[PDB]
Design an enzyme around this catalytic site. Structure first.
Site, mmCIF file in Angstrom:
data_model
loop_
_atom_site.group_PDB
_atom_site.id
_atom_site.type_symbol
_atom_site.label_atom_id
_atom_site.label_comp_id
_atom_site.label_asym_id
_atom_site.label_seq_id
_atom_site.Cartn_x
_atom_site.Cartn_y
_atom_site.Cartn_z
ATOM 1 N N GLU A 250 45.667 62.903 86.806
ATOM 2 C CA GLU A 250 45.813 64.368 86.817
ATOM 3 C C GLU A 250 46.027 64.974 88.210
ATOM 4 O O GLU A 250 47.000 65.700 88.404
ATOM 5 C CB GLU A 250 44.631 65.043 86.080
ATOM 6 C CG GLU A 250 44.710 64.819 84.575
ATOM 7 C CD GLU A 250 43.424 65.099 83.805
ATOM 8 O OE1 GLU A 250 42.461 65.655 84.397
ATOM 9 O OE2 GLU A 250 43.398 64.746 82.593
ATOM 10 N N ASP B 76 40.300 71.230 90.950
ATOM 11 C CA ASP B 76 40.709 71.429 89.537
ATOM 12 C C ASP B 76 39.551 71.968 88.696
ATOM 13 O O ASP B 76 38.593 71.263 88.423
ATOM 14 C CB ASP B 76 41.226 70.105 88.978
ATOM 15 C CG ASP B 76 41.891 70.242 87.610
ATOM 16 O OD1 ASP B 76 41.695 71.255 86.900
ATOM 17 O OD2 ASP B 76 42.634 69.311 87.239
ATOM 18 N N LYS C 197 37.757 64.307 74.307
ATOM 19 C CA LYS C 197 37.974 63.676 75.615
ATOM 20 C C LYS C 197 36.640 63.275 76.280
ATOM 21 O O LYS C 197 36.608 62.365 77.102
ATOM 22 C CB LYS C 197 38.768 64.604 76.526
ATOM 23 C CG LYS C 197 39.252 63.980 77.841
ATOM 24 C CD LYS C 197 40.319 64.844 78.462
ATOM 25 C CE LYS C 197 40.732 64.340 79.833
ATOM 26 N NZ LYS C 197 41.607 65.310 80.545
ATOM 27 N N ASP D 77 49.921 66.850 79.462
ATOM 28 C CA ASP D 77 48.557 67.038 79.925
ATOM 29 C C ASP D 77 47.641 67.129 78.697
ATOM 30 O O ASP D 77 47.686 68.103 77.938
ATOM 31 C CB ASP D 77 48.470 68.324 80.788
ATOM 32 C CG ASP D 77 47.032 68.745 81.132
ATOM 33 O OD1 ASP D 77 46.101 67.911 81.036
ATOM 34 O OD2 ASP D 77 46.845 69.935 81.555
HETATM 35 N N1 LIG Z 1 44.065 84.228 83.942
HETATM 36 C C1 LIG Z 1 42.859 83.548 83.793
HETATM 37 N N2 LIG Z 1 41.751 83.996 84.384
HETATM 38 C C2 LIG Z 1 40.600 83.352 84.245
HETATM 39 N N3 LIG Z 1 40.506 82.255 83.517
HETATM 40 C C3 LIG Z 1 41.570 81.738 82.871
HETATM 41 C C4 LIG Z 1 42.822 82.376 83.002
HETATM 42 N N4 LIG Z 1 43.702 81.679 82.284
HETATM 43 C C5 LIG Z 1 43.089 80.634 81.740
HETATM 44 N N5 LIG Z 1 41.781 80.672 82.083
HETATM 45 C C6 LIG Z 1 40.697 79.711 81.689
HETATM 46 O O1 LIG Z 1 41.031 78.392 81.975
HETATM 47 C C7 LIG Z 1 40.191 77.519 81.187
HETATM 48 C C8 LIG Z 1 41.052 76.383 80.625
HETATM 49 O O2 LIG Z 1 41.602 75.635 81.725
HETATM 50 P P1 LIG Z 1 42.696 74.499 81.576
HETATM 51 O O3 LIG Z 1 43.904 75.102 80.885
HETATM 52 O O4 LIG Z 1 42.945 73.987 82.959
HETATM 53 O O5 LIG Z 1 41.885 73.462 80.635
HETATM 54 P P2 LIG Z 1 41.827 71.843 80.626
HETATM 55 O O6 LIG Z 1 43.140 71.246 81.131
HETATM 56 O O7 LIG Z 1 41.542 71.441 79.216
HETATM 57 O O8 LIG Z 1 40.602 71.629 81.619
HETATM 58 P P3 LIG Z 1 39.231 70.848 81.313
HETATM 59 O O9 LIG Z 1 39.688 69.531 80.746
HETATM 60 O O10 LIG Z 1 38.488 70.748 82.633
HETATM 61 O O11 LIG Z 1 38.549 71.644 80.219
HETATM 62 C C9 LIG Z 1 39.567 78.392 80.104
HETATM 63 O O12 LIG Z 1 38.233 78.663 80.458
HETATM 64 C C10 LIG Z 1 40.429 79.667 80.176
HETATM 65 O O13 LIG Z 1 39.725 80.775 79.660
#
Ligand SMILES: Nc1ncnc2c1ncn2[C@@H]1O[C@H](COP(=O)(O)OP(=O)(O)OP(=O)(O)O)[C@@H](O)[C@H]1O
Length: 380
Positions: free
Chosen positions: A174, A197, A69, A9
């Site tokens: 995704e 998502d 990205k 991912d």
């Molecule tokens: N337990 C939690 N409670 C609230 N928020 C959380 C928790 N764990 C992770 N996050 C939040 O999730 C977010 C990151 O999400 P993710 O890991 O899905 O990112 P991503 O795949 O890069 O998504 P995008 O590409 O949309 O940014 C951050 O804002 C992080 O602070």
């Protein structure tokens, strides 16, 4: 011979890698002990290139790179690119028709990087993470992209792979990868799946149909600039005003103080997904003075309720575009770190009149999980 194929991912804000080993998917922790890795690169004054947590945890705001990205597979003059660069602290310049990133890599030496070269650095980190776990080199990967990604964005993601020394065997959507993680491809008959998502930087809603193991993306919606980063900012603005009221001091004058408050706010936010209050503590916060404050779950929700409620409008819109009503949805899949927030979970359930979503896989890992499921079959 493709060896052990990894599932990756590649996130706007956080990336995740899995493999199929001894009969099941394993999500792999990086060298800092984290099962997800910031999509971040930094270059120190000594010329060291940092990637991941070390990059994000470091102050060099012009020479830190993130959100690649948003730029990958797009031309310089793409209206989206021209808007986004207003908000990015690093320099972006036109080069070979593309938005190349320009930074000082040490000692005043300037270099430019294509967005796919930045994404390649992130993929290299994910590759190393897998190899450390596996005890051997990997050459091939399954990599995920948003369902709305076009031909150039998909090809640019493959090219990032190539630069990182990965043969990107399959590019997978995704929301489809999330569905696969939950075994939803192995249903009989036709089903409609709503994938919700909410990540760090983006919000994506997708309607997929599944019919004997084959997925079709019927409609997509969301908001490209709504995510957990925006919830952190609301909390930051709250405590900044409180501090000004308590002291008369505006902490926005000292950037590194803000950087500290941000790191701690994000940490507390996450704690509030499983506790009702959290304490924020920063030694010599501003002008030698200490910061110690608590944030309750109820206040975190108050500060962000409008943003939380705004997520329902794109769900309504994908249903319309798919000519479906709520009762036509057979499965609800919550994806993204921000779906760990209790109030986000409550709101989605209420929208679907009490229907429980799928559960059992950490929502920030589910996309890599599904990628790993496919990689396992490809490893044979
Ligand atoms: N337990 C939690 N409670 C609230 N928020 C959380 C928790 N764990 C992770 N996050 C939040 O999730 C977010 C990151 O999400 P993710 O890991 O899905 O990112 P991503 O795949 O890069 O998504 P995008 O590409 O949309 O940014 C951050 O804002 C992080 O602070």
């Amino acid at each position: 011979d493709v060896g052990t194929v990894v599932g990756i991912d590649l996130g706007t804000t956080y990336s995740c890698v899995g493999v199929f080993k001894n009969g099941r998917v394993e999500i792999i922790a990086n060298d800092q002990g984290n099962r997800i890795t910031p999509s971040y690169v930094a270059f120190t004054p000594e010329g060291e290139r940092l990637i991941g947590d070390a990059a994000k945890n470091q102050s060099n705001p012009e020479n830190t790179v993130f959100d690649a990205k948003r730029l990958i597979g797009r031309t310089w003059n793409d209206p989206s690119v021209q808007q986004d660069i207003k908000f990015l602290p690093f320099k972006v310049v036109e080069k070979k028709t593309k938005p190349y990133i320009q930074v000082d890599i040490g000692g005043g030496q300037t270099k430019t990087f294509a967005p796919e070269e930045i994404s390649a650095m992130v993929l290299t980190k994910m590759k190393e993470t897998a190899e450390a776990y596996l005890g051997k080199k990997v050459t091939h990967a399954v990599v995920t992209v948003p369902a709305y990604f076009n031909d150039a964005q998909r090809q640019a993601t493959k090219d990032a792979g190539t630069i990182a020394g990965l043969n990107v065997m399959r590019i997978i959507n995704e929301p489809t990868a999330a569905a696969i993680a939950y075994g939803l491809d192995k249903r009989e008959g036709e089903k409609n799946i709503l994938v919700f998502d909410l990540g760090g930087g983006t919000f994506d809603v997708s309607l997929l149909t599944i019919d004997n193991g084959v997925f079709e993306v019927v409609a997509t919606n969301g908001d490209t600039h709504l995510g957990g980063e925006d919830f952190d900012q609301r909390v930051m603005e709250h405590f900044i005003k409180l501090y000004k009221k308590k002291t008369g001091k505006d902490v926005r004058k000292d950037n590194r103080a803000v950087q500290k408050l941000r790191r701690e706010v994000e940490k507390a936010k996450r704690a509030l997904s499983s506790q009702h209050q959290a304490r924020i503590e920063i030694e010599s916060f501003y002008e030698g003075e200490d910061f110690s404050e608590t944030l309750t779950r109820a206040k975190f929700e108050e500060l962000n309720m409008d943003l939380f409620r705004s997520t329902m409008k794109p769900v309504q819109k994908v249903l319309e575009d798919s000519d479906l009503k709520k009762s036509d949805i057979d499965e609800i899949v919550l994806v993204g770190g921000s779906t760990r927030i209790p109030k986000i979970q409550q709101l989605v359930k209420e929208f679907f009149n009490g229907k429980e979503p799928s559960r059992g896989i950490n929502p920030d890992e589910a996309v890599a999980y599904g990628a790993a499921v496919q990689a396992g079959v490809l490893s044979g």
